[PDB]
Amino acid sequence: KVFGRCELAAAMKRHGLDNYRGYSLGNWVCAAKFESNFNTQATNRNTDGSTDYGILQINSRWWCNDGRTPGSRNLCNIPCSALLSSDITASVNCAKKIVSDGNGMNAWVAWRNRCKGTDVQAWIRGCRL
């Protein structure tokens, strides 16, 4: 599914991401825009052989099992294919674990380089939340 901006913001709020670990909702919408263009089915293969999955581009080296990333972990205890669902529950639950790991949202390269330090509230402007 390709979400709309305000549609995704509402879904992320219903799933508890607004102000999770201190990160306002606009941060999460901004990260999803630049990681996946709001597309739950996005995949991208990395240099090390791992793959990033879903709306928040969660990586198979640490967070999910895709059966083809040798010596990797599965810290979210899910198949990576669960992160491609039109339902964002699995991506949200795993993202909550990632953002609690110590480096906050700096784990997402697109967030650090394109959202951090900007007016992220603009990403939820106009939305009925």
Q: How far apart are CA 56 and CA 42, in angstroms?
A: 9
Q: How far apart are CA 30 and CA 101, in angstroms?
A: 20
* 18's tokens: 């607004």
52 counts as binding Na ion under rule CB under 5 A: yes
Query: 23 or 62: whose CB is closer to Na ion?
Result: 62
Which range binds Na ion by CB under 5 A, 8-16, 24-32, 65-73, 111-119? 65-73
Residue 75: its H or E element: none
Q: Which active-site residues does the annotation give? A: 35, 52
Instruction: Choose, by CB under 5 A, the member of 40, 51, 72, 91 that binds Na ion.
Output: 72
Which residues define the annotated binding site for substrate?
Answer: 101
